[PDB]
Structure 1
Amino acid sequence: TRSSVLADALNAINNAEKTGKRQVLIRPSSKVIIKFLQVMQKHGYIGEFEYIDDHRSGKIVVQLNGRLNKCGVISPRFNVKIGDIEKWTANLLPARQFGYVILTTSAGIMDHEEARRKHVSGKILGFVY
Protein backbone atom coordinates (compact mmCIF):
# COMPACT_ATOMS: atom_id res chain seq x y z
CA THR A 1 0.00 0.00 0.00
CA ARG A 2 0.99 3.63 0.45
CA SER A 3 3.60 3.93 3.19
CA SER A 4 4.87 7.51 2.78
CA VAL A 5 2.63 10.23 1.42
CA LEU A 6 5.74 12.43 1.28
CA ALA A 7 7.47 9.98 -1.06
CA ASP A 8 4.43 9.88 -3.35
CA ALA A 9 4.03 13.66 -3.16
CA LEU A 10 7.66 14.53 -3.87
CA ASN A 11 7.91 11.92 -6.63
CA ALA A 12 4.96 13.64 -8.32
CA ILE A 13 6.75 16.98 -7.92
CA ASN A 14 9.91 15.67 -9.60
CA ASN A 15 8.14 13.87 -12.44
CA ALA A 16 6.33 17.09 -13.32
CA GLU A 17 9.60 19.04 -13.21
CA LYS A 18 11.31 16.39 -15.33
CA THR A 19 8.60 16.74 -18.00
CA GLY A 20 8.60 20.55 -17.94
CA LYS A 21 5.19 21.23 -16.41
CA ARG A 22 4.15 24.11 -14.14
CA GLN A 23 1.66 22.22 -11.99
CA VAL A 24 1.07 18.91 -10.25
CA LEU A 25 -1.66 17.33 -8.12
CA ILE A 26 -0.74 16.05 -4.65
CA ARG A 27 -2.80 13.44 -2.78
CA PRO A 28 -3.40 13.05 0.15
CA SER A 29 -1.64 16.15 1.58
CA SER A 30 -0.50 15.31 5.11
CA LYS A 31 0.72 17.93 7.60
CA VAL A 32 4.35 17.12 6.85
CA ILE A 33 3.58 17.84 3.19
CA ILE A 34 2.77 21.52 3.78
CA LYS A 35 5.70 21.88 6.19
CA PHE A 36 7.98 20.36 3.55
CA LEU A 37 6.62 22.63 0.80
CA GLN A 38 6.46 25.63 3.14
CA VAL A 39 10.22 25.30 3.56
CA MET A 40 10.53 24.79 -0.20
CA GLN A 41 8.60 27.95 -1.09
CA LYS A 42 10.53 30.11 1.38
CA HIS A 43 13.64 29.34 -0.68
CA GLY A 44 11.88 30.07 -3.97
CA TYR A 45 12.04 26.55 -5.41
CA ILE A 46 8.27 26.09 -5.85
CA GLY A 47 6.29 29.24 -5.09
CA GLU A 48 2.50 29.26 -4.93
CA PHE A 49 0.71 26.06 -3.93
CA GLU A 50 -2.93 25.46 -3.10
CA TYR A 51 -4.80 23.17 -0.68
CA ILE A 52 -8.01 21.70 -2.07
CA ASP A 53 -10.09 20.63 0.92
CA ASP A 54 -12.02 17.52 0.18
CA HIS A 55 -13.59 16.04 3.28
CA ARG A 56 -11.49 12.87 2.95
CA SER A 57 -7.84 13.84 3.41
CA GLY A 58 -7.10 17.01 1.42
CA LYS A 59 -5.49 17.75 -1.93
CA ILE A 60 -2.60 19.98 -2.97
CA VAL A 61 -2.14 21.68 -6.34
CA VAL A 62 1.32 23.20 -6.74
CA GLN A 63 2.48 25.83 -9.23
CA LEU A 64 6.01 24.97 -10.32
CA ASN A 65 8.94 26.76 -11.92
CA GLY A 66 12.21 25.65 -13.43
CA ARG A 67 14.31 26.49 -10.38
CA LEU A 68 14.06 23.09 -8.69
CA ASN A 69 16.62 20.39 -9.52
CA LYS A 70 15.56 17.50 -7.26
CA CYS A 71 13.36 17.08 -4.20
CA GLY A 72 13.28 13.65 -2.58
CA VAL A 73 12.90 11.76 0.67
CA ILE A 74 15.44 9.72 2.62
CA SER A 75 13.70 6.67 4.05
CA PRO A 76 13.93 5.54 6.78
CA ARG A 77 14.06 8.81 8.71
CA PHE A 78 17.35 8.26 10.52
CA ASN A 79 18.19 10.00 13.77
CA VAL A 80 20.91 12.51 12.89
CA LYS A 81 23.08 14.07 15.56
CA ILE A 82 24.44 17.61 15.57
CA GLY A 83 27.81 16.20 14.49
CA ASP A 84 26.37 14.00 11.74
CA ILE A 85 24.76 16.86 9.81
CA GLU A 86 27.99 17.28 7.85
CA LYS A 87 27.93 13.73 6.47
CA TRP A 88 24.36 14.04 5.17
CA THR A 89 24.98 17.39 3.49
CA ALA A 90 28.12 16.14 1.75
CA ASN A 91 26.51 12.94 0.44
CA LEU A 92 23.19 14.27 -0.86
CA LEU A 93 23.86 17.88 -1.86
CA PRO A 94 25.44 19.01 -5.15
CA ALA A 95 27.62 21.62 -3.43
CA ARG A 96 28.01 23.29 -0.06
CA GLN A 97 26.99 26.81 -1.10
CA PHE A 98 23.41 25.92 -2.06
CA GLY A 99 20.80 23.29 -1.37
CA TYR A 100 19.00 22.44 1.84
CA VAL A 101 18.63 19.26 3.88
CA ILE A 102 15.15 19.16 5.39
CA LEU A 103 15.17 17.37 8.74
CA THR A 104 12.56 17.36 11.48
CA THR A 105 13.66 18.46 14.95
CA SER A 106 11.71 18.94 18.14
CA ALA A 107 11.41 22.61 17.10
CA GLY A 108 9.43 21.91 13.93
CA ILE A 109 10.63 21.36 10.37
CA MET A 110 13.74 23.20 9.19
CA ASP A 111 16.71 23.03 6.84
CA HIS A 112 20.24 21.93 7.70
CA GLU A 113 21.35 25.56 8.00
CA GLU A 114 18.49 26.73 10.23
CA ALA A 115 19.36 23.77 12.44
CA ARG A 116 22.93 25.05 12.68
CA ARG A 117 21.72 28.61 13.29
CA LYS A 118 19.62 27.22 16.15
CA HIS A 119 22.01 24.38 17.14
CA VAL A 120 19.30 21.71 17.30
CA SER A 121 19.10 18.24 15.78
CA GLY A 122 16.62 15.43 15.26
CA LYS A 123 15.35 13.16 12.48
CA ILE A 124 15.91 13.61 8.74
CA LEU A 125 13.00 14.08 6.31
CA GLY A 126 14.55 14.85 2.94
CA PHE A 127 16.28 17.32 0.65
CA VAL A 128 15.57 19.96 -1.98
CA TYR A 129 18.00 21.56 -4.42
Structure 2
Amino acid sequence: TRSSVLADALNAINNAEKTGKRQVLIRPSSKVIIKFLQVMQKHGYIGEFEYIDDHRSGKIVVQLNGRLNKCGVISPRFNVKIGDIEKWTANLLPARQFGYVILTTSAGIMDHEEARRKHVSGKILGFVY
Protein backbone atom coordinates (compact mmCIF):
# COMPACT_ATOMS: atom_id res chain seq x y z
CA THR A 1 0.00 0.00 0.00
CA ARG A 2 0.91 3.69 -0.03
CA SER A 3 3.43 4.03 2.80
CA SER A 4 5.22 7.35 2.27
CA VAL A 5 3.63 10.44 0.81
CA LEU A 6 6.54 12.89 0.52
CA ALA A 7 8.33 10.21 -1.50
CA ASP A 8 5.44 9.92 -3.95
CA ALA A 9 5.21 13.72 -4.11
CA LEU A 10 8.86 14.19 -5.03
CA ASN A 11 8.57 11.27 -7.44
CA ALA A 12 5.83 13.10 -9.32
CA ILE A 13 7.64 16.46 -9.16
CA ASN A 14 10.84 14.94 -10.49
CA ASN A 15 9.07 13.03 -13.28
CA ALA A 16 7.27 16.15 -14.45
CA GLU A 17 10.49 18.15 -14.37
CA LYS A 18 12.20 15.40 -16.41
CA THR A 19 9.45 15.71 -18.99
CA GLY A 20 9.85 19.49 -18.78
CA LYS A 21 6.32 20.30 -17.62
CA ARG A 22 5.09 23.24 -15.59
CA GLN A 23 2.66 21.92 -12.97
CA VAL A 24 1.92 18.81 -10.91
CA LEU A 25 -1.06 17.40 -9.04
CA ILE A 26 -0.10 15.76 -5.78
CA ARG A 27 -2.57 13.51 -3.99
CA PRO A 28 -2.72 13.42 -0.98
CA SER A 29 -1.14 16.29 0.93
CA SER A 30 0.51 16.61 4.31
CA LYS A 31 1.77 19.27 6.67
CA VAL A 32 5.26 17.87 6.10
CA ILE A 33 4.87 18.26 2.33
CA ILE A 34 3.74 21.88 2.74
CA LYS A 35 6.72 22.73 4.95
CA PHE A 36 9.08 20.96 2.54
CA LEU A 37 7.75 22.90 -0.42
CA GLN A 38 8.05 26.10 1.59
CA VAL A 39 11.73 25.26 2.07
CA MET A 40 11.98 24.73 -1.70
CA GLN A 41 10.10 27.94 -2.36
CA LYS A 42 12.30 29.98 -0.04
CA HIS A 43 15.38 29.44 -2.17
CA GLY A 44 13.07 29.26 -5.15
CA TYR A 45 13.44 25.89 -6.77
CA ILE A 46 9.72 26.28 -7.47
CA GLY A 47 7.40 29.21 -8.05
CA GLU A 48 4.07 29.44 -6.27
CA PHE A 49 1.74 26.54 -5.63
CA GLU A 50 -1.67 25.91 -4.21
CA TYR A 51 -3.61 23.75 -1.79
CA ILE A 52 -6.97 22.24 -2.70
CA ASP A 53 -9.44 21.02 -0.08
CA ASP A 54 -11.76 18.06 -0.58
CA HIS A 55 -12.39 17.51 3.20
CA ARG A 56 -10.34 14.29 3.10
CA SER A 57 -6.67 15.20 2.65
CA GLY A 58 -5.86 17.93 0.21
CA LYS A 59 -4.47 17.91 -3.27
CA ILE A 60 -1.70 20.23 -4.35
CA VAL A 61 -1.11 21.94 -7.68
CA VAL A 62 2.49 23.03 -8.07
CA GLN A 63 3.91 25.45 -10.59
CA LEU A 64 7.52 24.44 -11.21
CA ASN A 65 9.70 26.93 -12.99
CA GLY A 66 12.76 25.41 -14.58
CA ARG A 67 15.21 25.44 -11.74
CA LEU A 68 14.91 22.01 -10.18
CA ASN A 69 17.62 19.56 -11.19
CA LYS A 70 16.64 16.74 -8.84
CA CYS A 71 14.90 16.38 -5.49
CA GLY A 72 14.49 13.25 -3.45
CA VAL A 73 13.81 11.68 -0.08
CA ILE A 74 15.95 9.59 2.25
CA SER A 75 13.38 7.00 3.12
CA PRO A 76 14.60 5.59 6.44
CA ARG A 77 14.67 8.90 8.28
CA PHE A 78 18.09 8.65 9.86
CA ASN A 79 18.99 10.22 13.15
CA VAL A 80 21.79 12.71 12.57
CA LYS A 81 24.02 14.72 14.85
CA ILE A 82 25.82 17.96 14.06
CA GLY A 83 29.05 16.75 12.45
CA ASP A 84 27.04 13.99 10.74
CA ILE A 85 25.67 16.71 8.42
CA GLU A 86 29.17 16.95 6.94
CA LYS A 87 28.80 13.31 5.97
CA TRP A 88 25.48 13.67 4.17
CA THR A 89 26.39 16.91 2.42
CA ALA A 90 29.47 15.03 1.24
CA ASN A 91 27.20 12.27 -0.06
CA LEU A 92 24.15 13.82 -1.66
CA LEU A 93 24.98 17.31 -2.88
CA PRO A 94 26.65 17.97 -6.26
CA ALA A 95 29.14 20.47 -4.78
CA ARG A 96 30.03 22.23 -1.58
CA GLN A 97 28.67 25.40 -3.17
CA PHE A 98 24.92 24.77 -3.24
CA GLY A 99 22.26 22.16 -2.63
CA TYR A 100 20.26 21.64 0.53
CA VAL A 101 20.03 18.52 2.59
CA ILE A 102 16.92 19.16 4.63
CA LEU A 103 16.43 18.13 8.22
CA THR A 104 13.53 17.79 10.61
CA THR A 105 14.66 19.38 13.85
CA SER A 106 12.63 20.09 16.96
CA ALA A 107 12.72 23.71 15.81
CA GLY A 108 10.94 22.81 12.60
CA ILE A 109 11.89 21.46 9.20
CA MET A 110 14.57 23.35 7.29
CA ASP A 111 17.71 23.11 5.20
CA HIS A 112 21.04 22.13 6.71
CA GLU A 113 22.66 25.56 6.54
CA GLU A 114 19.98 27.04 8.77
CA ALA A 115 20.55 24.18 11.20
CA ARG A 116 24.23 25.12 11.10
CA ARG A 117 23.22 28.69 11.92
CA LYS A 118 20.58 27.74 14.48
CA HIS A 119 22.99 25.07 15.85
CA VAL A 120 20.40 22.30 16.04
CA SER A 121 19.93 18.88 14.49
CA GLY A 122 17.34 16.12 14.27
CA LYS A 123 16.32 13.67 11.55
CA ILE A 124 16.69 13.90 7.78
CA LEU A 125 14.05 13.85 5.06
CA GLY A 126 15.57 14.58 1.69
CA PHE A 127 17.81 16.55 -0.60
CA VAL A 128 17.20 19.35 -3.09
CA TYR A 129 19.53 20.80 -5.70
TM range (shorter): over 0.9
CA distance in 2, matches of 1:20, 1:47: 15
- Give structure 1 regions of 4+ aligned residues with deviation exceeding 4 angstroms: none
Report matched runs for 1:1-129 at 5 Å.
1-129=1-129
* TM-score for both structures, normalised by structure 2: 0.99
Secondary structure of 1:60 counterpart? strand
Q: CA deviation at 1:23?
A: 0.3
Identical pairs, percent: 100
CA distance in 2, matches of 1:124, 1:65: 25
CA distance in 2, matches of 1:117, 1:61: 32
Secondary structure of 1:79 counterpart? coil
The unaligned stretches of length 5 or more in structure 2 are none
Question: What is the number of residues matched between the two proteins?
Answer: 129
RMSD across aligned positions (CA): 0.5
**1:6-36 deviations in Å (ceiling 9; x for gaps):** 0000100000000000000011011100000
CA distance in 1, matches of 2:75, 2:87: 16
CA distance in 1, matches of 2:32, 2:97: 26
Q: CA deviation at 1:65?
A: 1.1
The unaligned stretches of length 5 or more in structure 1 are none
Q: CA deviation at 1:2?
A: 0.7
CA distance in 1, matches of 2:68, 2:40: 9
**1:80-99 deviations in Å (ceiling 9; x for gaps):** 00010000001000001111
